[PDB]
Amino acid sequence: GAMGDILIVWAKDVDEMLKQVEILRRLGAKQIAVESSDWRILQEALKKGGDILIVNGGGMTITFRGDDLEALLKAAIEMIKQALKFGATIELSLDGNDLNINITGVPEQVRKELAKEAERLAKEFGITVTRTGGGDVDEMLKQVEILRRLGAKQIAVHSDDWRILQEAL
Amino acid sequence: GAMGDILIVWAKDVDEMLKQVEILRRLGAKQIAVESSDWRILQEALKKGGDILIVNGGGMTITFRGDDLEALLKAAIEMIKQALKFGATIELSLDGNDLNINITGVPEQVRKELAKEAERLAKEFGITVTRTGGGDVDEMLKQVEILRRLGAKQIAVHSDDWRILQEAL
Ligand SMILES: [Zn+2]
Ligand SMILES: [Zn+2]
Incomplete structure (x- = not known):
């Protein structure tokens, strides 16, 4: 659209996430990225028809x-x-x-x-x-693999978080 | 990569942005999204070879x-x-x-x-x-158009920011 291609929703609760996604879809939003430390919220975002997720690995x-x-x-x-x-x-x-x-x-x-x-x-x-979230780089790699299997097309990470995880890896 | 597809860099200074992008590219990062309220920082991110930007319209x-x-x-x-x-x-x-x-x-x-x-x-x-940043929805629409002309492929917006701007529009 005229203001951009992707809306970023920070989701802390599954029901609030689904309510916010539906509100944006009614306003004509076409692509909604969901950010959460909660892997189940991100899986529910994929189930609802999203494919862009923002993950928290080391934070x-x-x-x-x-x-x-x-x-x-x-x-x-x-x-x-x-x-x-x-x-x-x-x-x-x-x-x-x-x-x-x-x-x-x-x-x-x-x-x-x-x-x-x-x-x-x-x-x-x-x-x-x-x-x-936080406390295991191996759990992060596993959960990212699971999001991809469940149909995630683009997974975004904070650069500071990614640098911490690479230093750990 | 194994942890995700996109690294998000929040840039407040052009030189710091270019330094952070080069640091991530040396660590093997392939796609770096730059977030800024400063339109010139986002234009410089495109000049450096990025195509994903996170904009601030109403904030x-x-x-x-x-x-x-x-x-x-x-x-x-x-x-x-x-x-x-x-x-x-x-x-x-x-x-x-x-x-x-x-x-x-x-x-x-x-x-x-x-x-x-x-x-x-x-x-x-x-x-x-x-x-x-902030203070003009018309200036936002113009600057988003300018980023696209300069080769932006994906422009992301905070959903709360987008809802404020739609209420204004
Ligand atoms: Zn974030
Ligand atoms: Zn942001």
């Missing part, structure tokens, strides 16, 4: 959940300060009572430390935390 | 610059809190003395307000701020 999505937004933001801000100091690229979104933080471009030991801090910060600020 | 990149990282982070944190409350998706990176904030998925009036707050926060914390 992770941290999701803070709670009714007090100011508590979510205090926890998120500490994660942001640390991740940026460690040289990470970060993606942020607020989805209802969920604050989603995608972290790429840090090695395994730093990822492990950030995941530990996420648990600590959640307990401090009286909220819950979920971690999706 | 903007805010860049805080200064020698005190703690000052950059205080300014960035206020921008993050506001942008998320307004329903924006945010991308963050630290590049030397530059803290880069890509904001999409907010209407023109909210973008205008966030750009004003960026100026105020910069003055408060004794740092400088640069704003790249």
Whole structure:
């Protein structure tokens, strides 16, 4: 179309992903790329008729959940300060009572430390935390192979994430 | 390759973009997509032999610059809190003395307000701020047309950014 060829949807929930894809298709969108750390969300994106996916191999999505937004933001801000100091690229979104933080471009030991801090910060600020993706380059290669078998035509990766994984490989 | 088909580089400077592209090509990368709010960076990415670009039409990149990282982070944190409350998706990176904030998925009036707050926060914390992209749907359509004439084959847009622009259009 006039503004571009591909719309990028960052999906954190299968039902929200399918709802967002249908909303864009009704507005006349022809190609929708789905980004997720969750392999099942990407498989569901292929099942819905997509073939462009954005994967997270060496990184992770941290999701803070709670009714007090100011508590979510205090926890998120500490994660942001640390991740940026460690040289990470970060993606942020607020989805209802969920604050989603995608972290790429840090090695395994730093990822492990950030995941530990996420648990600590959640307990401090009286909220819950979920971690999706990260922790195995072999699992990444396997899951990418599975997406291709399920009909993925173009798989995109953050360059910082790819460089971390090549250093590991 | 084994981990995917496309590497995504977020470029904030032409020389840094060309250096990052050459680093990935030496590691055996075959397809590199360049993302920028700066139309000249995307044109330079095409000149270097790329054909996949990620554009920002309705959003903007805010860049805080200064020698005190703690000052950059205080300014960035206020921008993050506001942008998320307004329903924006945010991308963050630290590049030397530059803290880069890509904001999409907010209407023109909210973008205008966030750009004003960026100026105020910069003055408060004794740092400088640069704003790249955003402020004209007609300019976006023109610049996308120019990228295609210059040989862009696939142009990607954040879905939240595309929905804001369709509501404007
Ligand atoms: Zn991403
Ligand atoms: Zn982006």
